Each structure stands twice: as structure tokens, then as C-alpha cells.
Design a protein around this ligand. Sequence first.
Ligand SMILES: CCCCCCCCCCCCCCCCCC(=O)OC[C@H](COP(=O)([O-])OCC(O)COP(=O)([O-])OC[C@@H](COC(=O)CCCCCCCCCCCCCCCCC)OC(=O)CCCCCCCCCCCCCCCCC)OC(=O)CCCCCCCCCCCCCCCCC
Ligand SMILES: CCCCCCCCCCCCCCCCCC(=O)OC[C@H](COP(=O)([O-])OCC(O)COP(=O)([O-])OC[C@@H](COC(=O)CCCCCCCCCCCCCCCCC)OC(=O)CCCCCCCCCCCCCCCCC)OC(=O)CCCCCCCCCCCCCCCCC
Ligand SMILES: CCCCCCCCCCCCCCCCCC(=O)OC[C@H](COP(=O)([O-])OCC(O)COP(=O)([O-])OC[C@@H](COC(=O)CCCCCCCCCCCCCCCCC)OC(=O)CCCCCCCCCCCCCCCCC)OC(=O)CCCCCCCCCCCCCCCCC
Ligand SMILES: CCCCCCCCCCCCCCCCCC(=O)OC[C@H](COP(=O)([O-])OCC(O)COP(=O)([O-])OC[C@@H](COC(=O)CCCCCCCCCCCCCCCCC)OC(=O)CCCCCCCCCCCCCCCCC)OC(=O)CCCCCCCCCCCCCCCCC
Ligand SMILES: CCCCCCCCCCCCCCCCCC(=O)OC[C@H](COP(=O)([O-])OCC(O)COP(=O)([O-])OC[C@@H](COC(=O)CCCCCCCCCCCCCCCCC)OC(=O)CCCCCCCCCCCCCCCCC)OC(=O)CCCCCCCCCCCCCCCCC
Ligand code: HEM
Ligand code: HEM
Ligand SMILES: COc1cc2[nH]c(C)c(-c3ccc(Oc4ccc(OC(F)(F)F)cc4)cc3)c(=O)c2cc1Cl
Ligand SMILES: [Mg+2]
Lengths: 96, 74, 192, 282, 205, 360, 33
Amino acid sequence: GAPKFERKMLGSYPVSPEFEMVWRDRLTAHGGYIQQTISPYQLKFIYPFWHTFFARCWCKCSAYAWPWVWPGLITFGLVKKMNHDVEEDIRDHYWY
Amino acid sequence: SRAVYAKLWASTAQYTQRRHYAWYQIWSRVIPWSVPWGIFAMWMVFPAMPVEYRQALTFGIWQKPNIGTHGPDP
Amino acid sequence: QFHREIGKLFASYSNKITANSPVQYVPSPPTKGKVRRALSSALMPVWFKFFRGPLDRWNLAVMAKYLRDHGLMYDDLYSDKEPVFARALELLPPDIQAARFRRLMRGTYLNHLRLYLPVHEQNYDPFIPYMAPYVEEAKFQLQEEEELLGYHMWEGVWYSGGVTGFGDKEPGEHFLVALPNLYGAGGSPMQA
Amino acid sequence: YVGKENTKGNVYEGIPLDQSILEPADLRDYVPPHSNIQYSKLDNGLRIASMDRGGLTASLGLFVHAGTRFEDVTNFGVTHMIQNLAFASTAHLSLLRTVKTIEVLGANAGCVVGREHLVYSAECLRSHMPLLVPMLTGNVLFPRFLPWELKACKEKLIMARKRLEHMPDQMVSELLHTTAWHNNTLGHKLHCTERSLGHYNPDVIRHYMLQHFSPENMVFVGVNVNHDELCTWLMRAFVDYNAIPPSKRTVASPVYTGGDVRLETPSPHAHMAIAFETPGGW
Amino acid sequence: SVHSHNIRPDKHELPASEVPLYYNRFDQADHPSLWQLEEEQQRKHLDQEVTDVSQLVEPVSSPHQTEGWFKRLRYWHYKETAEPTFPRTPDLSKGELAAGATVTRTSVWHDPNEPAIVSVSRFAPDNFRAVGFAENVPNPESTNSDSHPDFREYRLGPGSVDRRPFVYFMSASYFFITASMMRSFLCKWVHYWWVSRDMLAAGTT
Amino acid sequence: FMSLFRAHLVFYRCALNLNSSYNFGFLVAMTFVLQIITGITLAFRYTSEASCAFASVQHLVREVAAGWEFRMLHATTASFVFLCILIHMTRGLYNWSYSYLTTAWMSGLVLYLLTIATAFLGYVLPWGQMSFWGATVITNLLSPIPYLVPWLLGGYYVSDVTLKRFFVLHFILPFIGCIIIVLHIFYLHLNGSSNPAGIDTALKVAFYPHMLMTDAKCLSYLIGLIFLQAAFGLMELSHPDNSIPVNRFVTPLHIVPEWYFLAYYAVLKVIPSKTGGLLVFMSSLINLGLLSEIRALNTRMLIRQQFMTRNVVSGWVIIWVYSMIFLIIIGSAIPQATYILYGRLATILYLTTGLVLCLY
Amino acid sequence: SYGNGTVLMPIVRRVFIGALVGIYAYAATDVVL
Ligand SMILES: CCCCCCCCCCCCCCCCCC(=O)OC[C@H](COP(=O)([O-])OCC(O)COP(=O)([O-])OC[C@@H](COC(=O)CCCCCCCCCCCCCCCCC)OC(=O)CCCCCCCCCCCCCCCCC)OC(=O)CCCCCCCCCCCCCCCCC
Ligand SMILES: CCCCCCCCCCCCCCCCCC(=O)OC[C@H](COP(=O)([O-])OCC(O)COP(=O)([O-])OC[C@@H](COC(=O)CCCCCCCCCCCCCCCCC)OC(=O)CCCCCCCCCCCCCCCCC)OC(=O)CCCCCCCCCCCCCCCCC
Ligand SMILES: CCCCCCCCCCCCCCCCCC(=O)OC[C@H](COP(=O)([O-])OCC(O)COP(=O)([O-])OC[C@@H](COC(=O)CCCCCCCCCCCCCCCCC)OC(=O)CCCCCCCCCCCCCCCCC)OC(=O)CCCCCCCCCCCCCCCCC
Ligand SMILES: CCCCCCCCCCCCCCCCCC(=O)OC[C@H](COP(=O)([O-])OCC(O)COP(=O)([O-])OC[C@@H](COC(=O)CCCCCCCCCCCCCCCCC)OC(=O)CCCCCCCCCCCCCCCCC)OC(=O)CCCCCCCCCCCCCCCCC
Ligand SMILES: CCCCCCCCCCCCCCCCCC(=O)OC[C@H](COP(=O)([O-])OCC(O)COP(=O)([O-])OC[C@@H](COC(=O)CCCCCCCCCCCCCCCCC)OC(=O)CCCCCCCCCCCCCCCCC)OC(=O)CCCCCCCCCCCCCCCCC
Ligand code: HEM
Ligand code: HEM
Ligand SMILES: COc1cc2[nH]c(C)c(-c3ccc(Oc4ccc(OC(F)(F)F)cc4)cc3)c(=O)c2cc1Cl
Ligand SMILES: [Mg+2]
């Protein structure tokens, strides 16, 4: 949950059992904020996914390139070198 | 005075050593519980050992049961 | 009296430490040995130029680009689940606490969309240590408490008062003290 | 106590208290001590006075001429705040280590606020005097007044007058002062009010101490101590650091007005008090 | 609570304002403080000495009351039957009780020679007490009877031997018997787990 | 218990930047449910008697209505249990989740060992050649421990008595696992879950409906892929020799266990010593458990973000993953000197990566 | 530290470390030394 100095409540009404986990993670909104949300019944909800497709795909694929792909190519190459030495070792021992 | 303040600061310099002295005190109170648990363990595995070994740990006291069956063949 | 003899050994080693303790600051001794500090200096011009040097420089570039993409500072990466850092956050003044709150909100939103910030919003140094004065004061407060109160393994009543009895103070945080009530509507420890 | 060197245990085991265990080397011919008061002064102006009666428990006290009669409409409650922050963190010792070390020594200490004087005091075995002197003088030499420590003391600051309401004798006395010297000098209240919380910040406190807590306005007293040894350790507490500098202050004369005040409260008795002024005081 | 009351109309169990079951004779005090005088001027049966069951006081209640097929118990007091809009008016001259609906929905409390505010002040439940109250209802002084023993008869006082060694040898003996029982049950479970007599023989050749 | 249901599955608040990497705990749970349902159903017609076990499985498929569906679903879903667990564990090592979710990590490790033992017991039940000879071998690697083998079997060899008791244990252990899942969740919701960025944040929303619909979407894919594989047989998840009756005096030409046990079976195969190979087994588990105390192993204060994004030095978990894949290939190969050489190369990486995770 | 009841994990930490030091020391003496 949250730290003790954040869990402190301003009100006095008792915490209801269905809300025990909500108030175990209370966090103070330091400085305040203003929130605006639209009803899902009044939004386009598939077009936004494709409108931002190229930007999202660039971000994900760029992050994964070095750390995942570069070790994978090396592992693939080692798999081929291994299989090339096995064949040659079978003929140097059993073939005439 | 600075001399007084120095001695008060140093009073708690050996924290690590005092925690080690705590280890000794507690482990000395706990370690005797190994005897009850040890007796029960040997008590449980005694019948799974060979007859020759069962007579050694008891100084010849223990012997096979005599219930009146499986006697010598004439 | 076997306990009094062991206590004599502890006491002898204790008095020796005290008699050899300086009364002013003295630099700590070198850790690595002379044999290890000689090989490093001999291989340094080659090891540093081609390996260790570029490793250090790649590391800082990787960190800086990730933080700037999300609008974050390095110190924003520490958690309030650390006792030291939690105490430090309690000591902050309003203006610094508000800016951290806002950066953390914005960075969660950007990571959700997976969209970079524009380059002109990334023109800042993310490695400014804005938490340092409060971290060093927190360490001092908690080191005092531990030395003055936590120098022994204290006994206690077991499974009484909502706690286990082995040192916990906040109730219901271990499985063997889970489920405090069968009937009723329960309650909050923060409303006692 | 990391182990123990001595291993002889209770060497008086089995010996009842109707029998003495002393040896001839423990006997002396009594020599009375110096029971008259001796006087000394430091170069910064601190006055010192002590007397020895031969006891084993000493009493130590630091008196400051800075009571509630010196407050004004922008300061009401400041002397009570300083009393509740006594033995808090100083430049060379934290709050926790100060109060925990006094307890482990077996001593008792406190701070009491009044209308003309503030007093810090402690009592302890007479061999611990050098250890207790700095923990008394530090409150007036270099207190820090940390924000988070002021915020932890704000609770006990209001519970004083609340606890005063259910103490009839103390309430009649306060009402007598507030009514005798209307809005001046000896008529100011001792404790804070909810209004006082509007100026409970370090700058107001530190400004009050700079006007009243100079060494010339302080006296130190001990009982069951060696005079020369007390002077040496008091000199060592002030030699390396700078004290609040002196200041000239004019003391306003009290203005007696008299009057009448009532306070209804659930009680089976009717408390009544009538008084007059004594010209000149002490 | 999880229990509901059963206040409803009933055609066979008539309302108490018409069939009370309990003996319907009550005295009435102008102010309930007067009952303290009744308690000091009336005699109590429990202060007389009787020796035989045949001399015990006879109840004023009649045994003939509840009737019906397969009704085993034959005497009751109270019921939850609903009271109607216009209940029967109690007859105070015969000692009948006036309480609840029979005060609020009847004119039983009117008195020609008194203000209404004064008359109705005497019809709170603390103003009525059943005949026989002062003579009968017990008020015990202890849970213990002087005809029965208590700890004074059984206490081990000065000159007595210490019991601690015996109490703990009693408990220790129970435990070394119960420990042996457990060890035997576990050893038998392990044997059952091990090879059987038919397979041990097949291995020998 | 409905206030607990709404507190933990309706109003529980979660960080907005969660994604599919945080959905595989639910999928594992659902695989247990499916196994319990299909398992109990198979038990109504299975025979533990060794002389008739193999035949009871075939008769179940060939004669009983829908018998093929419950048999093939139980076999396929078992493979998906281990794939989900592997992805589940790898997320934790990528995000250093064990830093503050300590008892959640330890409880999870116990669940993993319980699932390993359950799967091993179930694979012996059909009583084919691979059932018998795989149990004989895997139960000999435990020979260094004295008398830990002849009792679990109750005989001088994997006889008909071992089969009866493996059935009862296999029946019971999954329900014990369900008990430990409750502890697992207790230790998680004590602290709250982490997020992909590794930061604290107040931008959280309720589980229902936003996050509940992501779990539901993933469930659809799982059910569709299980049925696809079960009803058409696209991949080869089972070995053909287990379609042959047991023969105690004829060893098959190639003995290899299921794919989810192959990698560590290869490690133990390239180490010649039998006692040294079992010590290697303990050290690996000990390393995983020690990660629960990673905060204390160095005085520098750690961070959850590990900075693998765009980093050419990669991360230790990624290097481990490829070493595991490399060993699955070695384990599936015929013994040959060249295979043994490279297998030892990969074993060093497999073990060293675990140890260095405790360094920072 | 003072104030919490996490009292078993510090024991598990010291047992695991010790076990590792013994496994890799028993293998070196058999292969190297
Ligand atoms: C390969 C398999 C995977 C599937 C195929 C590949 C994936 C893409 C398929 C195409 C679907 C997307 C089409 C374009 C977007 C449509 C929505 C929209 O907003 O468009 C207008 C929008 C602009 O319009 P606007 O004026 O701004 O706003 C208008 C709306 O009001 C804006 O309002 P809104 O934003 O709130 O949303 C409007 C809403 C309203 O949409 C409608 O118009 C309502 C339509 C109602 C029907 C819904 C579909 C149900 C179909 C079920 C199957 C048939 C059942 C019947 C019986 C069949 C019997 C055989 O849209 C929908 O609900 C979308 C419905 C379609 C869902 C996708 C169905 C695909 C599968 C179909 C077959 C079933 C699967 C096979 C199994 C069966 C056979 C074996 O433009 C875009 O969104 C941009 C378009 C570019 C994106 C498409 C990119 C395609 C290429 C990438 C994929 C390449 C292959 C995979 C590569 C990766 C793997 C290697
Ligand atoms: C005031 C009140 C007074 C009241 C009246 C008096 C009260 C007392 C009267 C009592 C009369 C007797 C009553 C009957 C008791 C016995 C019968 C009995 O109970 O039998 C059991 C009874 C049948 O017994 P059994 O199995 O036929 O008995 C066969 C024998 O055990 C056969 O066993 P075995 O042949 O397999 O093995 C025997 C072997 C076993 O041997 C061993 O296992 C070990 C032998 C080697 C030991 C090596 C020791 C080396 C070190 C020596 C150190 C020497 C130091 C010297 C120092 C000198 C200093 C000057 O022992 C020997 O050979 C003899 C020992 C000779 C050697 C001498 C040393 C002995 C050990 C000493 C240890 C140290 C002691 C001191 C410690 C403290 C100081 C350090 O079983 C039942 O009735 C079972 C009923 C079903 C029970 C159901 C339970 C519940 C089931 C549901 C469970 C689930 C729910 C949980 C429920 C939990 C509930 C708690
Ligand atoms: C051609 C052949 C035809 C054959 C068929 C039968 C033909 C019969 C024709 C008879 C014509 C002449 C008589 C007409 C009488 C009409 C009475 C009437 O309607 O009520 C008027 C009138 C109705 O007015 P009401 O206002 O309703 O009054 C009701 C009372 O208030 C009631 O309340 P209460 O408070 O006044 O009374 C107290 C109450 C409450 O008392 C108690 O709760 C106390 C109980 C204490 C018990 C203690 C027991 C301790 C000892 C235990 C021993 C060990 C046992 C366990 C061990 C067992 C081991 C195996 O007592 C009772 O509840 C009495 C229980 C009587 C049980 C008798 C049941 C006999 C059943 C016979 C079998 C029937 C067929 C069965 C099904 C067969 C298969 C389909 O009732 C009365 O005035 C009272 C009359 C009561 C008469 C009862 C006895 C009648 C017997 C008739 C003869 C039966 C002969 C059967 C054999 C024939 C062989 C050939
Ligand atoms: C039309 C004509 C036909 C063509 C069209 C297609 C036709 C086919 C049908 C249609 C198909 C398409 C239909 C539309 C699909 C729409 C949905 C969609 O796109 O789904 C993607 C979507 C991605 O999730 P997201 O929320 O968008 O983003 C999550 C982030 O990526 C998480 O990232 P993060 O940054 O938040 O977390 C950090 C970290 C945290 O870690 C994790 O999240 C866990 C670990 C992730 C890595 C997984 C790999 C490690 C496990 C290895 C397993 C070994 C198996 C052992 C057997 C080996 C046998 C030899 O995760 C990562 O690092 C993830 C990035 C991994 C990149 C891997 C790069 C590989 C490079 C390979 C290089 C090769 C070089 C050599 C080349 C040689 C030849 C030249 O996933 C889902 O929605 C899941 C739905 C299914 C649930 C699973 C149920 C089945 C379970 C079995 C499969 C298990 C894998 C499933 C994926 C797991 C992803 C985490
Ligand atoms: C509830 C609401 C919902 C509605 C109602 C639901 C109703 C149902 C709920 C249940 C109701 C009934 C009550 C059930 C009570 C159950 C007991 C209970 O709650 O205890 C919790 C209790 C925690 O209590 P707590 O209040 O939370 O905190 C206690 C302290 O105050 C503070 O302690 P701390 O916080 O400092 O540290 C605590 C930490 C302490 O952590 C530890 O001490 C470590 C424990 C795990 C160690 C093993 C993990 C792997 C480690 C690496 C490998 C090591 C190998 C061994 C060699 C080591 C080096 C010598 O514990 C944990 O992390 C928890 C782990 C969970 C363990 C649960 C297991 C229960 C027993 C059943 C075991 C079955 C195993 C089957 C699988 C294996 C089959 C072959 O847990 C324990 O302390 C018991 C630990 C037991 C460990 C058993 C390990 C067995 C496996 C060992 C490895 C063998 C490998 C062999 C391989 C061979 C290959 C051939
Ligand atoms: C996580 C839970 C479970 C797993 C991983 C699991 C795994 C397995 C596996 C791998 C097999 C061998 C399949 C084959 O190759 O034929 C099997 C068989 C079997 N299992 Fe399960 N099982 C689980 C739960 C259960 C439960 C709860 C039961 C009964 C209550 C059960 C009953 C059976 C039966 C009767 C068989 C023999 C039929 C057969 O081999 O097809 N299983 N199990
Ligand atoms: C039957 C097996 C398991 C089940 C049913 C299960 C279930 C879950 C569920 C539902 C979650 C929350 C959702 C999620 O993060 O996916 C979770 C989280 C977690 N699990 Fe598992 N789990 C299992 C095995 C494991 C194992 C083997 C480990 C590690 C060895 C583990 C460690 C964790 C951790 C560390 C988290 C918290 C992740 C975070 O918040 O960063 N669990 N588990
Ligand atoms: C860095 O990231 C990781 C490191 C990992 N390290 C290890 C050691 C394991 C692991 C644990 C237990 C286990 O159990 C065994 C079953 C069977 C056996 O024996 C045999 F022969 F295969 F049947 C031996 C053992 C097999 C494998 C992992 O899963 C694992 C996963 C990830 Cl992601
Ligand atoms: Mg650390």
C-alpha cells in the first residue's frame, strides 16, 4: 500500500469493507489537478488505435532491437556452426 | 563541551558487536530444543535399521521380540 | 557460570576496539591490494580506451534518452517503499513535492500511449540530484533510532493485539494474522 | 554492555542484612563540607552560585529572565512554545539521543515557564554533573528549531489550557491575574490559545530569544556540587562558540486596574475570591 | 439480529385484551415510589419455616387453560397476536390490566374529578403490579445455599503439602503415553508404505 | 465473502500503463481450472492397475463418446501450463519485481515446484514405454540421497504398486496448489502490483471494467489455441514411443522427456559426475530464492528500471533465455562428442547468468 | 530493522549464501586443487 503519511484521511466516515483496498493506497494530490473525461458512447474508439499506429510501432520496435535481436542472431549463427562441425566429425571417424 | 559531546557520540559505536552478543544470548536459549526433536527422530528410524545396529546403540539391552513363532527347524 | 566466561571474551575484544579508536576523522584504508592496483594501472590505457570507456558512455546515453522520452528525472525512479526514501519524501517542501507528483503522472500516461515527446520538450539535464539534502538527513534520523532502540532481540506476547509478537507494529501484515474478524464490518487502523 | 569483564558475581550471597560486610578501609573521620554559598562569574556575564551539603544527589538549574510579561500582541504564546521544545535537537545533539541518555543516567529534567522567569532543571547523581551541563545549556546556545519537530509538538500545545479548565484553583488564579492587570505585564496569560497558532514558526521564536536570552540575563545554580568543578565545566560549554549578544531593554511598569469576572461551570460549590494590590511587590 | 417477530392476526389465538391466559388481577399505584412501602410492610412466605412438600403454598393460578389435540404442555402466559383497531376496555374494578393498546385506543383513563394530564400519568407500566408480587418473588442473596458445601470445606490451608510436583507429573504422564501412541501409528503407516510379504519372497531365488 | 470479491476484483486500483505482460497470472490459474475439470472426468474411466492401465486409456478414446476430447485437452493444456509459467517468471526477472514483492516471489517458487512434481506424476499414468523408462531414469538421479527411491516405488523396480500411488498423489497435489494460490495473492495485494516503467504513480484506475476486459481478451486466445492444437495436431508435443506397451527387458533407442524438462535434463547430461550434477540442481534453486533478499546484498539503493531499452549490452534474463533454447536443442539430439562440447559451453552461460543477477 | 516483523527472511538469506559457498568450494577441490 501507500506510505503512512499519505494514507492519512481528511474525513471521518468509516471505511466500508468493499473499499478496504482503495483506501490502503490513498495518495495526496500535491498541487491539485483538473480532469476531463468523455463518455465512451460519444467517442470513436477504433480509429485512434490506427491513427497512432506508426508512432507506437516505431517506439516498441526501436526499444527491442539491440537487446533482443542482436543476441538472437548470434545464437542462430552458433547453431549453424555447431551442426557443420557435427557432420564433418562423423565422416572423419566412420567414412572411408 | 566538545569532549563531552564526543563521548556521547561514541557510546553507540559498537552496534555490530552488540548485535552479535544478542545472537549468542538467543541461540543459547533455543539450542536445547534439539534434544527432544532428536530423540523423536532416532525413535522413528530405529526399526528401519539392521538388527546388528539396533543392539549396539542400546548396549545389548534391546533384543528381538519373543512372541512364540518362527522357531528353529528340527 | 558458563555465561560469565563467554561474556569475558566478548568484553576483551570490545575493550580492544575502544582503545584503538581515533578521536577525529581519518581516511579509510585502500580496499584493493597493491598487486591488484598495479595490474589495473598497467592495463588501464588499453582496457579503458576500447572497453570500459565506451561502456560508461553508452550507459549514460541509454539512460538519458529513456528518461527524456518520458519527461522524467533520474531521482523519480526511486520508490516510496524504501524506509529511507519514504522519510525523505516527508521532509520535502511543497514546491518540490508538487513537481514530482506532476512528472510521475505525465510519465505513466506517456508509457501507456508509447509516444515520444517532441525534441524541444527534451532539452534538460535529467541527472540533477534534487533529493540529496533530504536523503542524508533521513539516513541520520533512522541510524539513531536503530542504535538507541534496536540493539537487542526483544521478546513479546505472541499473536496478541493484531500483530505476531516478533516485532511488527502495524496489524494484519502477515498471513498468520490474516482475517481479523468473522462478523461485523471491520475497520481501518488509520481510524483508531 | 558487550559482555562483562568481572566474573565474581554476588560476593555477598547468603549474608543477611542484620550483619555488616564493611571493612576497616571503608571507615573515615567525618569532615563537614562547605555549606555556605559561593559566587562566581564568567567573562560573558553568566553568574554562578553553588552550595554543598554533602549529599549524593545534586540539583542543577538554569534561570532565564524571559517570562510572559515581556510578550506582545504579535508574540502571545512564544514562551510556552519554548518550554515545550526544551531538550529538542541542538547543533551537537539530537532530540532522541538527549532524552534517551538522560533516562539511562537515572536523572530527571524539565522546563517550567512563569510570568517573570523560565527555568531548566535536572537532578542526578553528583558524579554525572559534567554530562548534564551541556544538555541544559544547549537549549539557549544553539537550538535548531526544525520544522518537523515543531509540527510534532503542536498537539501538546493546546491540551494545556484544556487540562487547566478541570483544575479550579489554577483557574481562579489565572482569572485573578488577567483581571488585576488588564492587558499588560503581569496580566498576560501563561499558555497559548488557538489564536497563538498563527505565529508558531521558527523566525518568531528566534527573534524573541535574541532579545532576552543573553548571558547577562541568566543565573546558574547547583546544590551538592564542588564549586570549582562546576565553574570549569560551565566555562568549557561557552568557550568555543558565540553566545547571543547583550541588549538594553526597558522594563514597563505594571498598571493595576482591578475589576470583576465570572465563569459559570458545573460544580457543587461557589468559588469566590476578592483581592487588592500590594504596592512595590518584592 | 436475524430473528423476526410474529405479530399477526389469528382466528384461534384471540388477542390478550380478550383472553389473557395469565391471571388478570393487578394493583395500581399513583406513583411507583410507593412500592417501596409495600415491600417493607408486607410479609414474605420465604421467611416462614416449612419442612414438608405438602405444606408449600398453593398457587393462585389455575391449571386448566390451554387445550387441544396433541398439546403436551398445558400452561402458558404471553402471545404475539395483533390487537384490533377498537380493543375491549379493561374493567379496573375487577383488577384488569391496562397497558399498551388498551391505554391508547380506549377511554379507560378518564377521571371526572382530575385533569387528563394527571390521570394518564398513572398508567405507565411501572404503575401496575400483579397480586402476590411482594409475598412471593424471590431476591437471592447468593448463588450458594447454606445447605450445600463450598470452598471452605475443601481448601488446603496452613500445614498442607505442596501440590505442584503432583499436578505436573499427572500431565507429563498423559503426554508420554500419548507420544508413544503417536509414534506407533506413524511406524505402522510407514510399514504399510513399504514392500509387502508377497513381493519380498519373489526377490529371493 | 462478497465484500472480499468486490474489494479485490472490482474496486482494486491499478496503474494505467499495464499491458499483456501482466495478464499471464490469470491464464495460469485458468489452466489449473481446466485441468481439474478434465482430470476428474478422466478419472471416472481410468484404471490404475498396471496390467490394464494402458488399455483403459485406449478404450476410452476408441469407444466412449467424446472420450477423445477430454484426453487430448488434458494433454495439450499441460503444455500451455508451462509456457504461461515461463512467460510469467520472465516478466519478473525483466522488471526486478522481487525487489519489493518478496514473499510473492518465494510463494511462486513453491507453486512452480508443485507443478513440476504434478506433471511428472501424470506422465507415468498412461503406462507406455516412455512412462516406465523415464521414471526409472529420473528416479535414479536421486540415488545419491540414501533410500529416497526404493520407498517411493514400494518395490525393487517401477512395478505395479508405484502406479497406484502416483495416481493418488496426482489426484491430490493440484488442490493443495489451489490453497497456495490464495497465499500468493495475499502477499501480492499486501504491497500492490508494479508497472512496466518501474515508477510510483497516482495515475491509477479501477480493475473493473478497464483491466477486467484485457484478461477476458487473452482468455479467448488461450481457449482458441488450445482447441486448435488439440483437435488438429499441428505440433508434436508427445513422444511416439508412449504408444507402445511397456517392456521391462527392451530399452527404447532414444529416451527423452517432455520439452519443458529437456533443458535441465541436458545440463545434467553433460556433467559426467552424478553427485556433482545434483549439487548443480540445488545451487540453481538457491539462487532463485536468494533474489527475495536482493535489497540487502549491496548498500547502494536499487531501482526497478533496468534500462534494457536500446541497450547493446542486453540483460541477463535475455541471455539466459537463449541459453535455455540452445540446450533444448542439445537435449533432443543423439549423444555425440561435438554436441557435448557445445552443451558444456551453454551450461556455463546457463548457470553464470543466474549468479550475476545477485550483483549490482 | 526495528519496527517490522520480517524475521525469517534474514535467516534464509544467510543459510542460502553459506550453502552456495560450500557447493562451489567442494567442486573446485575435486577438479582444480
Ligand atoms: C489476419 C487476421 C487478423 C484480422 C485481419 C487484419 C486486421 C485488420 C482487418 C481490417 C479491420 C480494420 C478496418 C479499418 C478500420 C475500421 C474502423 C475505423 O475506424 O475505420 C475508419 C477510420 C476512418 O473513419 P472515420 O470517418 O474517421 O470514423 C468512422 C467511424 O465512425 C469511427 O468509429 P470508431 O473508431 O468508434 O469505430 C467504428 C466501428 C464501426 O465499424 C463498422 O463499420 C461496424 C461493422 C460491424 C461488423 C463488425 C465486424 C464483425 C465481423 C465478424 C466476422 C463475420 C461474421 C458474420 C458471419 C461470417 C460467416 C463466414 O469499427 C468497428 O467496430 C470495426 C469492425 C471491424 C473489426 C475487424 C474485423 C476483422 C476480422 C473479420 C473476419 C472475422 C475473423 C475471421 C474468422 C471468420 C472466418 C474464418 O479509418 C481507420 O480507422 C483507418 C483505417 C486503416 C487501418 C487498417 C489497417 C489494415 C492493415 C493492417 C493489418 C494487416 C494484417 C495483419 C498484420 C499483422 C499480423 C502479421
Ligand atoms: C502420580 C500419577 C501416577 C499415575 C500412575 C503411573 C503413570 C505411569 C504409568 C505408565 C505405564 C505405561 C503405560 C503405557 C505406555 C506404553 C504403551 C504405549 O503407549 O504404546 C503405544 C501403543 C503400542 O505401542 P507399541 O508400538 O506396541 O510399542 C512397541 C515398542 O515401542 C517397541 O519399540 P522398538 O523395539 O521398536 O524400539 C525400542 C528401542 C528404541 O530405541 C531408540 O529408538 C533409540 C535407542 C538408542 C539410544 C541411544 C542413546 C545414546 C545416548 C546415551 C546417553 C547416556 C547418558 C548417560 C549419562 C550418565 C550420567 C551419570 O528402545 C530400546 O531398545 C530400549 C532403550 C534402551 C537403551 C537406554 C537408553 C534409552 C534412550 C535414552 C535417551 C535419553 C534420555 C534422557 C534425555 C535427557 C538428558 C540428556 O500404540 C497405541 O496404542 C496406538 C493407538 C493409536 C493412536 C492414535 C493416535 C492418533 C491418530 C490420529 C493422528 C492425527 C490427529 C492428530 C492427533 C494428535 C494427538 C496428540
Ligand atoms: C366398523 C369399524 C370401524 C373402525 C374405525 C374406527 C371407528 C370408531 C367409531 C367411534 C364412534 C364412537 C366414538 C366417537 C368419538 C368422537 C370424538 C370426537 O370427534 O371428538 C368430540 C369432541 C370434539 O370437541 P373438541 O372441542 O374438539 O375437543 C377436543 C379436545 O379438546 C382434545 O384436546 P384436550 O386437551 O381435551 O385433550 C388432550 C389431548 C392432548 O393430550 C396429550 O398430548 C397427552 C398425551 C400423553 C401421552 C403419554 C404416553 C406415554 C406412554 C407411551 C407408551 C410407549 C409408546 C412408544 C413405544 C412404541 C414402540 C413401538 O389428548 C389427545 O390429543 C388425545 C390423543 C388421542 C389419540 C388417539 C388416536 C387413535 C388412532 C387410532 C388409529 C386411527 C387410524 C390411523 C391410520 C391408519 C392407516 C390409514 O372431543 C371430545 O370431547 C374429546 C373426545 C376424545 C376421544 C378420543 C378417543 C376416541 C376413541 C374412539 C374409538 C376408537 C376405536 C379404534 C379401534 C376400533 C377397533 C374395532
Ligand atoms: C492476412 C494474411 C496472413 C498474415 C496475417 C497473420 C495471419 C495469422 C493470424 C492473425 C495473427 C494476428 C492477429 C492480430 C493480433 C492482435 C493481438 C496482438 O498483436 O497481440 C500482441 C499483444 C502484445 O501485447 P501488448 O500489450 O500490445 O504489448 C506488450 C509489450 O510488448 C510488453 O513489453 P514491455 O516493454 O511492456 O515489457 C518488457 C518485457 C517484459 O517481459 C515480458 O513481457 C515477458 C517476456 C517477453 C518475451 C517473450 C520471449 C521469452 C520466452 C521464450 C519462450 C521459449 C519457448 C520454449 C520452446 C522453444 C522451442 C525451440 O517484454 C518484452 O521485452 C517484450 C518484447 C519481446 C520482443 C521479442 C523480440 C524477438 C526477437 C527475435 C530475433 C530473432 C533473431 C534470429 C533470426 C533468424 C532468422 C533470420 O499480445 C497480446 O495481445 C496477447 C494475446 C495472446 C495471449 C497469450 C495466449 C497464448 C499463449 C502462447 C503464446 C505466448 C506468447 C504471446 C505473446 C506475449 C507477449 C508479451
Ligand atoms: C484467506 C482468504 C481467502 C478465503 C479463505 C481461504 C482458506 C484457505 C487458506 C488456508 C487455510 C488453512 C491454513 C493453511 C496454513 C498453511 C501454513 C501457513 O500459512 O504458513 C505460512 C508461513 C508464513 O507465515 P507468515 O505469518 O506470513 O510469516 C511468518 C513470519 O512471522 C514472518 O516471516 P517472513 O515474512 O520473514 O518470511 C516468510 C517466508 C519464509 O520463507 C521461507 O522460510 C522459505 C519457504 C520456502 C522454501 C522453499 C522454496 C524454494 C527455495 C529454494 C530451494 C531450497 C531447497 C532446500 C535446501 C536449502 C539449503 C539448505 O515465507 C514465505 O515466503 C511464504 C511461502 C509460502 C509457503 C507455503 C507452504 C505451506 C506448506 C506446504 C508445502 C507444500 C510443498 C509442495 C511442493 C514441493 C513438492 C516436492 O510460511 C512459513 O513460514 C512456512 C514455510 C514452509 C516452506 C515449505 C517448503 C517446501 C519445499 C522446500 C523445497 C524442497 C525442494 C526439493 C526438491 C527435490 C527434487 C527431487
Ligand atoms: C495442473 C494440474 C494437472 C496437470 C499439469 C496434469 C498433467 C497430466 C499429464 C501430463 C498427464 C499425462 C497425459 C498423457 O500423456 O496421456 C496426465 C494424465 C492424467 N491426469 Fe492430469 N494433470 C493435472 C490435473 C489432474 C487432476 C486434478 C486429475 C484428477 C483429479 C487428473 C487426472 C489425470 C488422469 C486420470 C490421467 C491419466 C489419463 C491420461 O494419461 O490421459 N489430472 N495429467
Ligand atoms: C499456479 C501458478 C501461479 C499463479 C496462478 C499465479 C498468479 C498470479 C497472478 C494472478 C498475478 C497478478 C497478475 C499478474 O501479474 O500476472 C501474479 C503476480 C505475480 N506473480 Fe504469479 N502466479 C503463479 C506462479 C508464479 C511464479 C512461478 C512466480 C515466480 C517464480 C510468481 C511471481 C509473481 C510475481 C513476482 C508477481 C507480481 C508481479 C508484479 O506485480 O510485478 N508467480 N501471479
Ligand atoms: C533467469 O531466468 C530463469 C532462470 C531459471 N532457472 C532455473 C534453474 C529454472 C528451473 C527450476 C527448476 C527446474 O526443475 C527441474 C525439473 C526437472 C529436472 O530434471 C529433469 F531431468 F529435467 F527432469 C530438473 C529440474 C527446472 C528449471 C527455471 O525455470 C528458470 C526460469 C527462468 Cl525465466
Ligand atoms: Mg541495496
